[PDB]
Amino acid sequence: GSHMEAQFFTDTGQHRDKNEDAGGIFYNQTNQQLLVLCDGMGGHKAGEVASKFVTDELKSRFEAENLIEQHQAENWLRNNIKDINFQLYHYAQENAEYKGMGTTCVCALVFEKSVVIANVGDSRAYVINSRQIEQITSDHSITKVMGTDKRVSPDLFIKRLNFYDYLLLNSDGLTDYVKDNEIKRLLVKEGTIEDHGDQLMQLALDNHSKDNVTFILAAIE
Ligand SMILES: [Mg+2]
Ligand SMILES: [Mg+2]
Ligand SMILES: [Mg+2]
């Protein structure tokens, strides 16, 4: 399976009690790579329950797969996001402390020359090179989220990566307070993923983000 060097970064921020963001980098039986990021909310402070509900489901479902070829990826992401939305909605309805909770979800199935992205909400996926930064997803924003209705309609995107250097998935705690050009200029410099991720996180904290800040940085070879 195709996989990029990638790392997951999260921080509650200085202005939040809890971290209601979630995410991860998961590998299936043939080492294909799945990037996941979720921004939860709602319920009786149950936002972390919703975002980690979806992240855990995607992890278990993906690790159960042997091979998802690129021509199957759109359908796999769409059907599983729909089923997870169904399960999360009813999990929340059955628990008065959770009722009303929901979460965004942006995720990406990695392939050799492309990535397949599914999105629900206002978390984002970007591609960045030395000269441009393109937001692949469109914010669904009040925000459309998973878990609040028995129906959900995720957007699917296929993006060739050949002429880019970084793939970025992030919660709105980053891009509400850091401009796209600030992100690009930070990434066009030399450095590893860890250091690029730490300066990007410290940059979000320096702009005094009042939200949970979470992102995945993936290097495109
Ligand atoms: Mg949130
Ligand atoms: Mg937002
Ligand atoms: Mg947020």
Query: 62, exposed or middle or buried, with CB in 10 Å at 0-12, 13-18, 19+?
Result: buried
| Solved using | X-ray
187 is in an annotated binding site: yes
206 is in an annotated binding site: no
166 is in an annotated binding site: yes
Q: How are strands ordered across the β-sheet holding 124-128? A: 5-11, 213-219, 166-170, 124-128, 133-135
CA of 173 to the centre of ligand 1 (A): 8
Token pair 């991720």 is found at 197
CA of 192 to the centre of ligand 1 (A): 28
CA of 145 to the centre of ligand 3 (A): 12
47 is in an annotated binding site: no
11 is in an annotated binding site: no
Span between the terminal Cα atoms of the chain, in Å = 15
CA of 121 to the centre of ligand 1 (A): 11
Domains of the chain in start order, with CATH, are 1-221 (3.60.40.10)
In this structure, are residues 34 and 51 in contact, taking their beta carbons and an 8 Å threshold? no
Q: What tokens does 174 get?
A: 């980053």
CA of 126 to the centre of ligand 3 (A): 17
In this structure, are residues 215 and 175 in contact, taking their beta carbons and an 8 Å threshold? no
> With the CA atoms of 76, 81, 82 and 84 taken in that order, what torsion angle do they form, in degrees rounded to the nearest 10?
120
172 is in an annotated binding site: yes
Q: What residues pack around ion ligand 2 (CB closer than 5 A)?
A: 122, 172
Q: Strand pairing of 105-110 and 102-103?
A: unpaired
According to the 3-state scheme, what is the secondary structure of 114-179?
A: EEEEEEECCCEEEEECCCCEEECCCCCCCCCCECCCCCCCCEEEEEECCCCCEEEEECHHHHCCCC
CA of 16 to the centre of ligand 1 (A): 10
